[PDB]
Symmetry: D3
Subunit: 182 residues, 6 copies
């Protein structure tokens, strides 16, 4: 069973589900809208080998960024052309990592799924390529995997980028660890 708006409000009110910052107007019929942070990550390696720590570069946009499909063959000329014509702060091609502004904490009886917003899916822009299910007990912001599959797409800082859908677990889960006191 998926939590409706009424449930989302209840759980947030009692702190069963943490959402920071929380915006009551972001609560939908059965989901909670999340927004795009201004910090992005761009990898800098020939190939990705998870056995190692990948090399990357961190950038912060003032207002917007243009995400181009892979192999868009971006040149210095094309970049300045886009920045001037569309007033974007940064221009990237291929995959780029983003983050939600929202930090969340899930209880042991709730799992959440993140999904990119439909209006962006409509222009072939995704902010997550996997199902996006999150383990009960999870604490943190949501990492976004942004990729455009047709034409370059303009994304704006703080814009609604996706939604979290909350589902009840059949039973309380062992989140992986337990803590007590002296």
């Amino acid at each position: 069973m998926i939590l409706s708006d009424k449930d989302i409000i209840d759980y947030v009110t009692s702190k069963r589900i943490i959402i920071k910052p929380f915006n009551k107007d972001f609560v939908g019929p059965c989901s909670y809208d999340v927004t795009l942070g201004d910090e992005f990550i761009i990898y800098d390696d020939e190939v990705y080998d998870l056995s190692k720590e990948l090399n990357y570069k961190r950038i912060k946009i003032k207002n917007s960024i243009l995400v181009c499909p892979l192999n868009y063959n971006l040149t210095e000329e094309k970049i300045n052309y886009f920045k001037e014509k569309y007033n974007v702060d940064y221009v990237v091609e291929g995959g780029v990592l983003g983050t939600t502004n929202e930090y969340i904490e899930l209880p042991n009886d709730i799992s959440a799924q993140y999904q990119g917003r439909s209006s962006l899916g409509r222009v072939f822009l995704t902010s997550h390529q996997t199902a996006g299910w999150i383990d009960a007990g999870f604490k943190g912001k949501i990492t976004l995997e942004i990729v455009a599959f047709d034409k370059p797409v303009i994304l704006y800082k703080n814009q609604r980028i996706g939604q979290l859908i909350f589902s009840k677990l059949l039973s309380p889960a062992d989140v992986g660890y337990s803590e007590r006191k002296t």
Copy 2:
């Protein structure tokens, strides 16, 4: 909890969930198969800026369409080559918008998720790049975001293209508005 075939039939029978047209043979163990409409949309802009109304072209296929991966570099020669060799009515590359033939209406206690069919996923053809969850209270046909990630794929008008999975909400949702009478 996901609705089984028995539940799907019940809800459709009592009009709790509207599906038009409805085909009882499209009801699976825990989903409902939907079909591909003959109308598609192709955007025509350098970049996609959601602040504006995107430019596009509407096409209607007589029977089939060939969807090629992005940057397939389609030329007039290649198009006629495909149309003649595979008898396809249209040839496109990159993302293309489609629609289900089916129109649905969801009650305030049901959310639905659309997923592209497995047989097509098996050939790297997707008709939705996001989770595809639909808000309770939704009314309308399903918009498809079609993209091929390996080789061109032939799609046929009216073919089963995906499935809707229905989930119960924990509580009735506020669909966003309420209506009364004089």
Copy 3:
């Protein structure tokens, strides 16, 4: 409602849900980790027409494989360069079919969703492009659709590749057929 770790263990113990081979340490708060088999499939056709039986080649890796994004333009020189530098057994570009080592059987009251692991999504590598919901009653291994969307990614035989999330059905489903005896 999604099954928690406690439920997963219960169902596996009573054989309601079959998982072979089963590793108790693969049970998470609300999912079960699956691993990557050593056999892969690569299609060999100009276009994919589902009306026919697609041509393909089966390969078996000794330890690892390098999955490059589509149109990576792999040459014999580049392949030997990768195999020597990263010690990979095979080098492929575009979509490649894989399989989980695990074979599963789902009861008539459970549906499962497969999702690629987050650590790999983080490097733009997916092992399924659709929602990945599996019908109740399903029996078999999970077919993986592997695609890299940014840079080549190294995958290792037997590594955890994704997770199965189990959901209860609202009612028992008709899996499609029934069997009796003389």
Copy 4:
């Protein structure tokens, strides 16, 4: 998860839950009202020994019955007094077994609970001694255990006597029997 009016309607429509006879007006927010049959059973043995076959007499009423609390001492004169004053066809004291008019069949994924009617509870008349849960897979009419705890109560043939609350099972049961 208790079935709401809409769910009850759905399950009856698809024959997942059988209710014969069925009246849509008996469907409440989350229950289905059942009615009192005209047939009753009165045990005639000295004590109840479940290890033995119980003797009883079958009683059928035309319109109504007066249920008196145990030890009401129903003399021959008192019974006639009650029949003429309240127009009851039969007068009994202590326990009496009745039955719903409705015959039901439950699927392997539903369990139901029978509850006596609220209005009757308020006059200390009960139609069930136990909680009233009915196994998934059950088939049959519902046996009523009628007892009055304060003063005599008149029951009418075919009157609503209680309700069935339907609950979903977490998983399908093995209704082999």
Copy 5:
């Protein structure tokens, strides 16, 4: 699906479930304790005929009441004996209607069941004849059907008398009434 302490707290906080008055200390693992009001109702007619309007007397107690089993034969001397020995304000035999202090309102997606307090059950005192399920959409105080089955039992004004167990409905009900 029965609501746990955390759920009850949430539903009361957002006013999905109304409970007036409300005391957080009455919230248990999966129920909410309710208390006994000082007002009771005693029927004064010879028999219960639901087809007619019932006559009754309104009784209000200051502190406590002694509930005796039916046919306890409460002579004038016995009543005074009980009042002086147990300091009860009123002595009654057989059934007596009471009410919870708490007024509740249930949403269209919740049904509740009232259950008599365990400690009282152990002394054979019941405060409800039926299963106790309350329709989704219900509004009002809970009517108590009090009867003692073994020996007289003293009940105190405002004491915890039972509990409400809340259950989720599978779907929203049509609480038009």
Copy 6:
């Protein structure tokens, strides 16, 4: 959501729900049958005052007990008559407290309801005065409130006396106590 036979089996196997002793044959479509212990408690005070400590006598039977309705007037001759005719070890009238043989422990996500056996309900014998819901987190044997409402009923040591219906909680409870 009520647990089905398969769920009960799973929860007992993983020790989520403790039942000692446990017999797989007692698992029904959606319940678990419990049995009658040989120990009973009979209160010996004039009235029940929960504000005070209750006096009682401990009774243990070898094989069976005869439960008579209240005010059955069990003279010395009547008792011997019943013992010799029905081979019962003890004869009591009114309420008697019993206990299940089974000891249980419930997890923070399950609540259980005890219900008296159907066959016994049909002979107007009840083993619980309240609805019977048991808090999540509970540990212990189940106390039985036995009362006969029609005629004397013979109960046998170790016989199935009722059943436990297990329900899932919507969320985990805070079973601190």
